[PDB]
Design a protein around this ligand. Structure first.
Ligand code: NA
Ligand code: NA
Length: 207
């Protein structure tokens, strides 16, 4: 019925773990991230993966992406930058990658419906396999949930940012997204952790 991604694996151990639970995972490259790995290391993880594994990056220009895809043999990419729809399509046509495009939830301003219309317009510029909404922190988070809830009615989105076993349940029947993306919420000491993932999954696994 749904889609769970566990993002930001850095080792084979972490990867084989998430594959027991998640519908997809991700390896971060060329980004500002505690989870960044070098391209070669990403390549090795991508080679052994049994589920979809996204090449996750904030890379902004096509050659950067083209080169990363070439070195990793990624079949999936998560585009976590405002890269032009045409550049995305180029990567799709020239490399056969499937794309999840990440969108920051805009907070400014000030009614959730207005940011949602600004985001819907932005989303509709893209021709991509999946849409990921990256929610933020602070009290502005409930605003992000409402924005995301509007969006999730027009597209089967993947809800992301700040999800934990303790808050994902609320997140889900608030936004009712098609999927959820989790990274640090299932890490014990920066390592993908089984009991946390199971606890996270236990909340998801109800429909
Ligand atoms: Na293990
Ligand atoms: Na088990």
């Amino acid at each position: 019925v749904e889609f769970v991604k566990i993002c930001g694996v850095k080792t084979m151990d972490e990867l084989r773990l998430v594959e027991r639970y998640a519908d997809a995972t991700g390896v971060v490259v060329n980004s500002r991230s505690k989870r960044k790995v070098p391209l070669k290391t990403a390549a090795e993880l991508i080679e052994m993966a049994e589920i979809p594994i996204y090449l996750v990056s904030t890379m902004k220009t096509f050659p950067e992406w083209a080169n990363a895809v070439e070195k990793t043999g990624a079949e999936y990419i998560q585009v976590h930058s405002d890269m032009h729809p045409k550049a995305v399509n180029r990567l799709k046509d020239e490399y056969g990658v499937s794309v999840m495009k990440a969108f920051m939830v805009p907070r400014e301003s000030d009614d959730p419906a207005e940011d949602a219309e600004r985001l819907l317009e932005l989303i509709g510029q893209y021709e991509v396999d999946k849409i990921l909404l990256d929610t933020g922190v602070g009290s502005g988070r409930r605003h992000d949930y409402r924005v995301s809830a509007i969006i999730a009615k027009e597209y089967p989105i993947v809800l992301a940012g700040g999800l934990t076993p303790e808050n994902v349940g609320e997140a889900i029947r608030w936004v009712k997204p098609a999927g959820v993306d989790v990274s640090s919420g299932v890490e014990r000491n920066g390592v993908k952790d089984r009991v946390l993932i199971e606890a996270f999954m236990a909340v998801v696994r109800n429909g």
